[PDB]
Amino acid sequence: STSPTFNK
Amino acid sequence: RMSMVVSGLTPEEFMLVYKFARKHHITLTNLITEETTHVVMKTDAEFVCERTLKYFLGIAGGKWVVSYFWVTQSIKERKMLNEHDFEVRGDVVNGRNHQGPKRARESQDRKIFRGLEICCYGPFTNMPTDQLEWMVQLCGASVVKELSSFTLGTGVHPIVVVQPDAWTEDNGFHAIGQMCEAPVVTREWVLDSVALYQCQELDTYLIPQIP
Secondary structure, eight states: OOOOBOOO | OOEEEEESOOHHHHHHHHHHHHHHTOEEOSSOOTTOOEEEEOBOTTSEEOOBHHHHHHHHTTOEEEETHHHHHHHHTTSOOOGGGGBOOEETTTBTTOOHHHHHHTOTTSOTTTTOEEEEOSOOSSSOHHHHHHHHHHTTOEEOOSGGGOOOSTTOOEEEEEOGGGOSSOGGGGSSTTTOSSOEEEHHHHHHHHHHTSOOOSGGGBOOOOO
16 A cells, blocks of 8 residues: 555 | 544455445545544454554554454455454564554553653654654653643653654754753654553663763
């Protein structure tokens, strides 16, 4: 999806 | 009663969920709100997902955070399967079986940031400031908008949250302590704490402040 993910 | 959002799905996968919701007369929306009861996350076969804003807010709100497999398996059995059986167990960052979603569902009377005052001090990327503020509020914190506005007192615990990467040529995140007396931590302190639904020690997140 267009949704940002939050990784390190 | 029930109201779902999805996260991490392709526009298509959203369409199977859409078919499912239509058939069962389940509320499905694109935006998460206080009324949302379920956040349907794309996961791998062991119910591990990616950390999205909807994932964080779902846990912060004590909602059902369940795998997309709930939908596909339900369709496959033309029944309406039980959420529990598909709860997300962890994520690709904080642990495959941390059981954060279940802990949040089960800890609404003892929120992780209860008794904390937090200032989300910008700038930030990929996550609008007022959503980070909502997240911490849902988690029991009191939101403070300006550094000069922290409540004072030995019983108060102020914390400044920043995202160092968001700044540039602005080693100014080291100069916040000069404006206030509060530990300064990265946004990861918030994000890890929420995903695990356990307030992390500030130590590994602390940002050195110039005297």
